[PDB]
Amino acid sequence: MTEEELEKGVEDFLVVHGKFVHRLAGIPPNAKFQALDKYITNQIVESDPSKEKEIKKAFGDAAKILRDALARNITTPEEAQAFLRDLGPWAVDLINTITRRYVDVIEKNPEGVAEILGISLEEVRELAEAGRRAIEEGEGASLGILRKILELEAERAK
């Protein structure tokens, strides 16, 4: 696949990934998570220049997976995980890899997340911590990150 085709897959990922995570959280779309989602996805792509086409291809694959799940009655992480196991272990491992990278990006560049989200470095630490817990619970890092963003956003209206 060309660079243009790989880029359109990453663009498709950002659209369906934001819609699907917000569905699992049960809230209307959040502007701050969308900017974080785009920031993190690009950092994952640029993380390894040697595997750039591979990581881009993985995001295009996840876009087709999440697009299928969006058209089906899947509203909880438990239903999402059972949907991935029916696709096969390849889809479970692909989503997990993406999920583990998501937290890594946060921890490796805490200031960039603090600038994008307009929060403190300690609140970024809470964001990565909340992403580690959600992986342990088997509900994805981005869902636990979104839930913590809503809390920080609600707290910071003080």
Side-chain angles (χ1 to χ4, degrees), residues 50-74:
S50 63
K51 293 179 179 179
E52 190 153 358
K53 308 180 82 70
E54 170 178 338
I55 270 69
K56 287 180 177 180
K57 202 268 185 183
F59 279 113
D61 296 333
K64 303 176 183 178
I65 297 177
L66 298 172
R67 184 185 306 265
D68 187 16
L70 273 175
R72 316 186 90 173
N73 190 9
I74 299 173

CSV table of all heavy atoms in Angstrom, one decimal, residues 50-74:
chain,number,residue,atom,x,y,z
A,50,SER,N,11.1,2.7,11.2
A,50,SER,CA,11.4,1.5,10.4
A,50,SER,C,10.1,0.7,10.2
A,50,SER,O,9.9,0.1,9.2
A,50,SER,CB,12.5,0.7,11.1
A,50,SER,OG,12.0,0.2,12.3
A,51,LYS,N,9.2,0.7,11.2
A,51,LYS,CA,7.9,0.0,11.2
A,51,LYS,C,6.8,0.9,11.0
A,51,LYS,O,5.6,0.6,11.4
A,51,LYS,CB,7.7,-0.8,12.5
A,51,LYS,CG,8.7,-1.9,12.7
A,51,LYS,CD,8.5,-2.6,14.0
A,51,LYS,CE,9.4,-3.8,14.2
A,51,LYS,NZ,9.2,-4.5,15.5
A,52,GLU,N,7.0,2.1,10.3
A,52,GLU,CA,6.0,3.1,10.1
A,52,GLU,C,4.8,2.5,9.2
A,52,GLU,O,3.6,2.7,9.6
A,52,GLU,CB,6.5,4.3,9.5
A,52,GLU,CG,5.6,5.5,9.5
A,52,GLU,CD,6.3,6.9,9.6
A,52,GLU,OE1,7.6,6.9,9.7
A,52,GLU,OE2,5.6,7.9,9.6
A,53,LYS,N,5.2,1.9,8.1
A,53,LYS,CA,4.1,1.3,7.3
A,53,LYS,C,3.4,0.2,7.9
A,53,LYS,O,2.2,0.0,7.7
A,53,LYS,CB,4.8,0.9,5.9
A,53,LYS,CG,5.6,1.9,5.2
A,53,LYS,CD,6.2,1.4,3.9
A,53,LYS,CE,5.2,1.4,2.8
A,53,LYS,NZ,4.9,2.9,2.4
A,54,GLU,N,4.1,-0.6,8.8
A,54,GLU,CA,3.4,-1.7,9.5
A,54,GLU,C,2.4,-1.1,10.5
A,54,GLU,O,1.3,-1.6,10.6
A,54,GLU,CB,4.5,-2.5,10.2
A,54,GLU,CG,3.9,-3.5,11.2
A,54,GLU,CD,5.0,-4.4,11.8
A,54,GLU,OE1,6.1,-4.5,11.2
A,54,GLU,OE2,4.8,-5.0,12.9
A,55,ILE,N,2.8,-0.1,11.3
A,55,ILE,CA,1.9,0.5,12.3
A,55,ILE,C,0.8,1.2,11.6
A,55,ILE,O,-0.4,1.1,12.1
A,55,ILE,CB,2.7,1.4,13.2
A,55,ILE,CG1,3.3,0.7,14.4
A,55,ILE,CG2,1.8,2.6,13.7
A,55,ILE,CD1,4.4,-0.3,14.1
A,56,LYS,N,1.0,1.8,10.5
A,56,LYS,CA,-0.1,2.4,9.7
A,56,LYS,C,-1.0,1.4,9.2
A,56,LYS,O,-2.3,1.6,9.3
A,56,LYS,CB,0.5,3.3,8.6
A,56,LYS,CG,1.1,4.6,8.9
A,56,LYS,CD,1.7,5.3,7.7
A,56,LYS,CE,2.3,6.7,8.1
A,56,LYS,NZ,2.7,7.4,6.8
A,57,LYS,N,-0.5,0.2,8.8
A,57,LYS,CA,-1.4,-0.8,8.3
A,57,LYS,C,-2.2,-1.4,9.4
A,57,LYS,O,-3.3,-1.8,9.2
A,57,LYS,CB,-0.5,-1.9,7.6
A,57,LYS,CG,-1.2,-2.8,6.6
A,57,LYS,CD,-1.8,-4.1,7.3
A,57,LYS,CE,-2.4,-5.0,6.3
A,57,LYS,NZ,-3.0,-6.2,7.0
A,58,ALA,N,-1.6,-1.5,10.6
A,58,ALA,CA,-2.4,-2.0,11.8
A,58,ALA,C,-3.6,-1.1,12.1
A,58,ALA,O,-4.6,-1.5,12.5
A,58,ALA,CB,-1.5,-2.2,13.0
A,59,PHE,N,-3.3,0.3,12.1
A,59,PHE,CA,-4.4,1.2,12.3
A,59,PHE,C,-5.5,1.1,11.3
A,59,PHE,O,-6.7,1.3,11.6
A,59,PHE,CB,-3.9,2.6,12.4
A,59,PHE,CG,-3.3,3.0,13.7
A,59,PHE,CD1,-2.0,3.2,13.8
A,59,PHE,CD2,-4.1,3.1,14.9
A,59,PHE,CE1,-1.4,3.6,15.1
A,59,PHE,CE2,-3.5,3.4,16.1
A,59,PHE,CZ,-2.2,3.7,16.2
A,60,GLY,N,-5.2,0.8,10.0
A,60,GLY,CA,-6.2,0.6,9.0
A,60,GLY,C,-6.9,-0.7,9.2
A,60,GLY,O,-8.1,-0.7,9.0
A,61,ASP,N,-6.3,-1.7,9.8
A,61,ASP,CA,-7.0,-2.9,10.1
A,61,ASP,C,-7.9,-2.7,11.2
A,61,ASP,O,-9.1,-3.2,11.2
A,61,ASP,CB,-6.0,-4.0,10.4
A,61,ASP,CG,-5.1,-4.4,9.2
A,61,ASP,OD1,-5.5,-4.2,8.1
A,61,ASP,OD2,-4.0,-4.9,9.5
A,62,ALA,N,-7.5,-2.0,12.3
A,62,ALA,CA,-8.4,-1.7,13.4
A,62,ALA,C,-9.6,-0.9,13.0
A,62,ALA,O,-10.7,-1.0,13.6
A,62,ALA,CB,-7.6,-1.0,14.5
A,63,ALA,N,-9.4,0.0,12.0
A,63,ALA,CA,-10.5,0.8,11.5
A,63,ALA,C,-11.6,-0.1,10.9
A,63,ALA,O,-12.8,0.1,11.2
A,63,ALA,CB,-10.0,1.8,10.5
A,64,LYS,N,-11.2,-1.1,10.2
A,64,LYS,CA,-12.2,-2.0,9.6
A,64,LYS,C,-12.9,-2.9,10.7
A,64,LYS,O,-14.1,-3.2,10.6
A,64,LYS,CB,-11.6,-2.9,8.6
A,64,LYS,CG,-10.9,-2.2,7.4
A,64,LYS,CD,-10.2,-3.1,6.5
A,64,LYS,CE,-9.5,-2.3,5.4
A,64,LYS,NZ,-8.7,-3.2,4.5
A,65,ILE,N,-12.1,-3.2,11.8
A,65,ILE,CA,-12.7,-4.0,12.9
A,65,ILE,C,-13.7,-3.1,13.6
A,65,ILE,O,-14.8,-3.5,13.9
A,65,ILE,CB,-11.6,-4.5,13.8
A,65,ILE,CG1,-10.7,-5.4,13.1
A,65,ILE,CG2,-12.2,-5.1,15.0
A,65,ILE,CD1,-9.5,-5.9,13.9
A,66,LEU,N,-13.3,-1.9,14.0
A,66,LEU,CA,-14.2,-1.0,14.8
A,66,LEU,C,-15.4,-0.6,14.0
A,66,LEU,O,-16.5,-0.3,14.5
A,66,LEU,CB,-13.4,0.2,15.3
A,66,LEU,CG,-12.2,-0.1,16.2
A,66,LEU,CD1,-11.4,1.2,16.5
A,66,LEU,CD2,-12.7,-0.7,17.5
A,67,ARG,N,-15.2,-0.4,12.6
A,67,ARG,CA,-16.4,0.0,11.8
A,67,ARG,C,-17.4,-1.2,11.8
A,67,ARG,O,-18.6,-0.9,11.8
A,67,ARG,CB,-15.9,0.2,10.4
A,67,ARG,CG,-17.0,0.7,9.4
A,67,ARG,CD,-16.5,0.8,8.0
A,67,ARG,NE,-15.3,1.6,7.9
A,67,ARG,CZ,-15.3,2.9,7.6
A,67,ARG,NH1,-16.4,3.6,7.4
A,67,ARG,NH2,-14.1,3.6,7.6
A,68,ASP,N,-17.0,-2.4,11.8
A,68,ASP,CA,-17.9,-3.5,11.9
A,68,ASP,C,-18.6,-3.5,13.3
A,68,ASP,O,-19.8,-3.7,13.4
A,68,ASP,CB,-17.2,-4.8,11.7
A,68,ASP,CG,-18.1,-6.0,11.7
A,68,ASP,OD1,-19.3,-5.8,11.5
A,68,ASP,OD2,-17.6,-7.2,11.8
A,69,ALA,N,-17.8,-3.3,14.4
A,69,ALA,CA,-18.4,-3.3,15.7
A,69,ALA,C,-19.4,-2.1,15.9
A,69,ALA,O,-20.4,-2.2,16.6
A,69,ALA,CB,-17.3,-3.2,16.8
A,70,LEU,N,-19.2,-1.0,15.2
A,70,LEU,CA,-20.1,0.2,15.3
A,70,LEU,C,-21.5,-0.2,14.7
A,70,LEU,O,-22.5,0.3,15.2
A,70,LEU,CB,-19.5,1.4,14.6
A,70,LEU,CG,-18.6,2.3,15.5
A,70,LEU,CD1,-18.0,3.4,14.6
A,70,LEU,CD2,-19.3,2.8,16.7
A,71,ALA,N,-21.5,-1.0,13.7
A,71,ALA,CA,-22.8,-1.3,13.1
A,71,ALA,C,-23.5,-2.4,13.8
A,71,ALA,O,-24.7,-2.8,13.4
A,71,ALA,CB,-22.5,-1.8,11.6
A,72,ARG,N,-22.9,-3.0,14.9
A,72,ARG,CA,-23.5,-4.0,15.7
A,72,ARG,C,-23.8,-3.6,17.1
A,72,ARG,O,-23.2,-2.6,17.6
A,72,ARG,CB,-22.7,-5.3,15.6
A,72,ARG,CG,-22.1,-5.6,14.2
A,72,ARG,CD,-21.4,-6.9,14.2
A,72,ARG,NE,-22.3,-8.0,13.9
A,72,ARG,CZ,-21.9,-9.3,13.6
A,72,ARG,NH1,-20.6,-9.6,13.7
A,72,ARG,NH2,-22.8,-10.2,13.3
A,73,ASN,N,-24.7,-4.3,17.8
A,73,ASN,CA,-25.1,-3.9,19.1
A,73,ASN,C,-24.0,-4.3,20.1
A,73,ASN,O,-24.1,-5.3,20.7
A,73,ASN,CB,-26.5,-4.6,19.5
A,73,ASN,CG,-27.0,-4.0,20.8
A,73,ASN,OD1,-26.6,-3.1,21.3
A,73,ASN,ND2,-28.1,-4.7,21.2
A,74,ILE,N,-23.0,-3.4,20.2
A,74,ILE,CA,-21.9,-3.6,21.1
A,74,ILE,C,-21.7,-2.3,21.9
A,74,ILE,O,-21.3,-1.3,21.3
A,74,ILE,CB,-20.6,-4.0,20.3
A,74,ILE,CG1,-20.8,-5.3,19.5
A,74,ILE,CG2,-19.4,-4.1,21.2
A,74,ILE,CD1,-19.6,-5.6,18.6
